[PDB]
Design a protein around this ligand. Structure first.
Ligand SMILES: Cc1cc2nc3c(=O)[nH]c(=O)nc-3n(C[C@H](O)[C@H](O)[C@H](O)CO)c2cc1C
Ligand SMILES: Cc1cc2nc3c(=O)[nH]c(=O)nc-3n(C[C@H](O)[C@H](O)[C@H](O)CO)c2cc1C
Lengths: 121, 121
């Protein structure tokens, strides 16, 4: 009848130095470390905002996704101004916050240059 | 002291023909159409599993994300076998499902060749 898909489980973020990316997403951005799993196929590094249904895999093994190539990623936050102040204190350049029709937004990049947005609806 | 980020609001999937991509994600994969609006950089086309927190935007304006370049996107399903049967019936070529250490998983491609996974843990 209808599909049994509930949500996006995860998607991939292309990085170079995975240790550097781990420290960034976990320590600086504040995500939980869900898994850090070396194996035959590479190091599976998985992170998410605490309690979030959809997680991020910090991957270096997809040739069609060069490190730092990701754009158009937006994180929902309940306090964009406080998050921007924290990021700035933690050594991250933040563009914003700014008001938009869809919420108050800010932009920053990770160590490889992937572009990450924040939005407080 | 802790970040106020709750979850990924949305992320971007690089497509060429947005109308074809819309029809694929909505009609074939069963997502809801949240938005289809004129935007600053192009047509803002936003889709998501029904009821889900994180949505996908089907974009054509990021030169670092060529159409069909995306990998490592996995959808959580409560019935991977039934979903694969629906996808086959709808004309999609599916690889799997098979049991893995990480769950019961299948893979398929969208019209541009972005690679999309299904997983039932
Ligand atoms: C729920 C939501 C809906 C959005 N809808 C649109 C839209 O319809 N058109 C648009 O140009 N941008 C939209 N944006 C923001 C988009 O990222 C915008 O183009 C940039 O903020 C400026 O380039 C939306 C953001 C969110 C969070
Ligand atoms: C929770 C979870 C953990 C996974 N861990 C790994 C892993 O450690 N190593 C791996 O090669 N694949 C892993 N996979 C497989 C992965 O879904 C799949 O191969 C890619 O997403 C598509 O290329 C995992 C999948 C899930 C759902």
């Amino acid at each position: 009848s209808h599909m049994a898909i509930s949500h996006v489980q995860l998607f991939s973020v292309p990085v170079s130095d995975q240790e550097k990316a781990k420290d960034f997403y976990v320590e600086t951005v504040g995500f939980d470390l869900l898994a850090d799993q070396p194996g035959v196929h590479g190091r599976w590094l998985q992170v998410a905002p605490k309690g979030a249904d959809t997680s991020l895999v910090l991957v270096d093994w997809f040739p069609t996704m060069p490190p730092g190539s990701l754009r158009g990623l937006l994180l929902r936050t309940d306090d964009v101004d406080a998050d921007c102040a924290r990021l700035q204190e933690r050594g991250v350049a933040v563009d914003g916050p700014k008001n938009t029709p869809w919420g108050r937004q800010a932009m920053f990049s990770d160590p490889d240059g992937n572009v990450i947005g924040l939005n407080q609806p």
